[model samples]
Target chain A: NVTINPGPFAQTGYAPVNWGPGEINDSTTVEPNEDIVISKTSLWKEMQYNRDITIRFKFANTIIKSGGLGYKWSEISFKPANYQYTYTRDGEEVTAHTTCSVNGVNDFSFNGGSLPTDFVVSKFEVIKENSYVYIDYWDDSQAFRNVVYVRSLAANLNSVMCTGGSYNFSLPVGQWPVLTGGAVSLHSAGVTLSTQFTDFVSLNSLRFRFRLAVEEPHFKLTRTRLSRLYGLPAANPNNGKEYYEIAGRFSLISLVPSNHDYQTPIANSVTV
Target chain B: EMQYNRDITIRFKFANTIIKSGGLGYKWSEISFKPANYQYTYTRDGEEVTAHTTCSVNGVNDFSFNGGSLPTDFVVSKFEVIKENSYVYIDYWDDSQAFRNVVYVRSLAANLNSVMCTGGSYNFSLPVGQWPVLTGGAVSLHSAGVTLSTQFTDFVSLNSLRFRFRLAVEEPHFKLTRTRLSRLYGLPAANPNNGKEYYEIAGRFSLISL
Candidate 1:
């Protein structure tokens, strides 16, 4: 399943305040019927200026109105994350915060009355992207949490298209398993592996799916046949083995592919 | 024979296993450290404040203050970069250094980029000389297992460059192809564009002297 999560949103210079769930997967949890909510209070830091940057996750789900006051809790707020990048700007130490803007709105206001106010406008009011966002709690207290974030200015870097079903493709056990966290595989015969970010995409927008296909026959399973699957190198060294399978394959779809040949290292690894 | 760019771009992504040195890979079973081993300070507006992170084996952690400061568990999550005039500036983020730190790449050219000196009498610097060969790629510098440089005279020619920058409270280990050979033999283009030439020599020790 393609799951997305937009954690919290905040303005530059404004310190991170409280959240409805206390912390990501804390005492409070996101319920299906209830919209996942995140709120940041007044200014807590003194800086040169501020930028609107809100961060929210959980794939795509319609935002529901939890009404009472003139406020909404389902919309995505492009609030800045707590971490800020500091670098030399014109030889002086300047900082830039990560903006979680859905469509270019990171500064959150309390019910639209400008920031630094007591009534902070919540993110659930505009959480629109529709990719299934939620927190599945475990052990009554622990929440299945993965504070995932994405970074891509253009659609070119936006979403990735990957397809992986099994690992070996022999039996159910030999079949590629469901891998979680961050991991990657390259069976050089057909897998074209490169190390660069433009190669590995962020998660804000990723298109992933699964499909079943008839297993290939012996001779037809030559490196010649496999590499033709998607014009990518898909030949496996162990092609003759019944278990010689990809487990799965993923092809990151690019809207406007460019020459930015750099890859971000993956952290978590899937099970298969 | 003109080959397709055969190049790929790894878009900035958030993964669970980024480039960092940890796990049971290092043979340093006897090596260990504690939080107290670190102590520093930061200055802002002519004011000096303690620059140390505190982590505990307890409740949930928050990095909302001091600019995404890691919760003292110094786990390096990512390495980032931006291009400057003739080179790219790289940096990494970790739990201990709430401050976004930067690393420098100061070399100008490499043998692979047709920037090499061959069959020429040269003056070189080395701790000792055993007919030491002329290595024309680049050298990496480390301080306490943290990377300080990834200098390549021609990192520009890979046409693209990307790496997992690391910043840890502890150190890192090593692996195969963890070191690279961008230039070898009597020719310049001695290796294919495989990751083998890309070494990850950042973590593993603390303060190795020349």
Candidate 2:
């Protein structure tokens, strides 16, 4: 039997940059409750705002009693609303509806009895095509292990290179492997709500945190070679402009009522 | 629970010149004991008294000890590099000669091209160009009656070598440990634990004259 005892939801104030005529907000009503609300306003075409809002949630010292069998978690669901965007080009307004969905739950059940005594959900990030989560834990011999999980992607497509089909793999821990290439799209995406669980082994306790970041799109001017050589003005490119307005409240539910002993030490040995 | 009257002295010698504890025109160095429970006693005016021992060197306190329990390690309070050939000697005397312990550190001129460690269980002669023979692991230095010496192969200048030594233990038998000479030339130092009872010394040698 495994249990999860979650701590108070600690959140940082919404950090907004370059926001003009728009704002972002989040709140937690009470203690020991995982419910959180996050919302952001859309930017108009004439507003010329490249707005970005980032919020962090830390569930420090979330105790987990593995009871000799490890713990496992599959699918996490989210509910999002009004995740549509309207674009204006040549006096024409085009609105497109988008969908944020979770498909094909991956199994993370511990088959063998051997597992780390202490673990933490170090980081969680959501992108357009997939979401990524990193679990950092210490093995029985007091060695560090970093396990990565990618959701909704069949193969490794980003900077965090891993095998296809296998959603999770052990990666070298130290620095966070960033998802490179370009900006991540999170307009109509919803937060992870429900995570299906299974009985798994050795973790005496666990610590986890979550983060949600949203950015409003804006156009940028890329100067051509002729413009740079001749000292001419560069035209503004609207090819990758994000005209979407994301406004919704994200809530975390069903992560409660787990068993944990206060006296049990989190790890078996001390690390230098 | 055996209480012993102990006197300790440290001497630094260079170029046939000597500065030592309890010497004229020199101040005595200070020493401290650990675990704090040990007792220090001496006979003054035929009356038993408890106090610390003091000695002097060059208007400075060269070495001073509380004369309580034997010191496990010495903390170097002051050190001045002598470019000339030099040596440091630590002398310990309790009530009997059986408890008298002595450790010596000798720094000599050596060739700048190569270095070698001889007269121990592990002996190797290698050029300074190939100093890193192995990347990891500790080399053990354990022997009863062997003189371990590291001699340089190429000669550059007199100030190219200097040695520093620390006396670890004096009572209940003498033990020398943790010589860091190998690290002077970018080589791995000897295994930290030569033995429970051992003496350790370190030497610094550079090819470039400084």
Candidate 3:
């Protein structure tokens, strides 16, 4: 039950490029893409107990430029499948949905023309909301979503030429019941960089790394117990429960990729 | 010549429950007290009686104690819980106003080893008014609600007392934006866009606990 099927792993690849001089050109070249299979293992000592998991996306030696005829932009979007699982709570079978995101960095994009320097394009803008990472637990019936925000590192998108730093996405394993069980699968979980240019854009390397870290007291405490200690009230008025203690096979499949830089890139582009 | 001195330590756990952007944001809630064990030795009827006490939550969600008893010369009347700058004060006293004692419990985010105070200094000392108080009086012990009040009589001196506490809590990390980042590095604020121009702001929010 503690084994991970695919893996707790990552991969890298080149982005798809569309070469056009204000319009699509028949000579456009597209690079082959690969699926970054996402999986979790509860067997590892760090994964065994409740801990924090951070998945990081790193890009190095990125280049985006215009060939004088067309505006250029580049984007990297990480689409993680929406996880679905069912668990028994108070003798009733309840289904739960958990979605994950890297906030400002997910579906992130930047323009080649507007950036004063290559470093600026590599840097990420600071969105106030993205600065703080959170988990929203909703009651099946109630309209309110209980919010539990954990402290996380501030977004540092200042990697010059996108060669130095990484964009991190993290969440607590205990807060998400699906993580406790073995082999939680995220189907179609991968990173895609979509770009448009008249000249050329090249990335020396792109990588993804997922890490699981364990702290003191381990993950011995139950989800309900941790919730009580956290002072989270029950979702339902009468239920007095903030979240459900989920156990069973959990999987997220068929995730619809959202818009990033590639979608309406020019219309949303700001030139200064 | 009966003498008594007791040192008590209480522990608490704190969690951040604040939510933002339709999700939980990084923030911390007030610290709440947890259970603790108490042991004491005192002279009763010309002999030293050492007792160990255990505590638990009662039906009313108040701290209740068992397994040990104080001398008849002592009586506990009332209890009070107070919130301070960095700690919670749980005080117990007698009605006769003869004896009073309090336990101060402090909390720190687990990820952070130390915190900088408002005055830009670390390891600052608290005002004398906030220190725990102990008075002399006849003895009685009472535990009604969440607080414990004790009254003592003919107490001579406190020999030796030791206390300990532990904490394990989640600490949020924050990313510095334009304005905060500018101030942190003493960058120019005149250009509004100065933060983006600075190389220092490009790195992650890194801190050394030591």
- lDDT per residue as tens, model 2, B77-195: 32221111222222212233212221232322221121111111222222111111212221111111112222222242111112222111111211111111121111112222123
Please write out the lDDT profile of model 1 over residues A75-190, one tens digit for every residue: 32222122234444333454433211122111222343543311222442221112112211111111101112112111111222212221121112222321111111211111
Candidate 2 lDDT over residue span A1-272, tens digit each: 11122222211111111101111122222212597444232111111112122111111111122233223222212222123344443435444333322222121222223345322221222232333221111121101111111121111111211110112222234322111121322222222212222221112212111122323332111211111111100111111333222222212122111222231213212111
lDDT of 2 at B99: 24
Better of 1 and 3 by DockQ: 1
Q: Which ten residues in a row are the worst by lDDT in model 2 chain A?
A: A141-150
Q: Report DockQ per prediction, comma-separated.
A: 0.01, 0.01, 0.00
The interface RMSD for candidate 1 is 22.3
lDDT by residue (tens digit), candidate 3, A1-272: 01112222211111122111111112222332787533222221111112122222211122233333223223222222234455444446555444332233212233334533221122222212222121222223111111111111112111111111222212222132211211111111222222233222321211111222212221111222322111101111112223222122211122111111221112111111
DockQ of the two-chain complex in candidate 3:
0.00
Q: Whose TM-score is greatest here?
A: 2
TM-score per candidate, chains pooled = 0.13, 0.16, 0.15
Which 10 residues in a row give candidate 1 chain A its minimum summed lDDT? A137-146
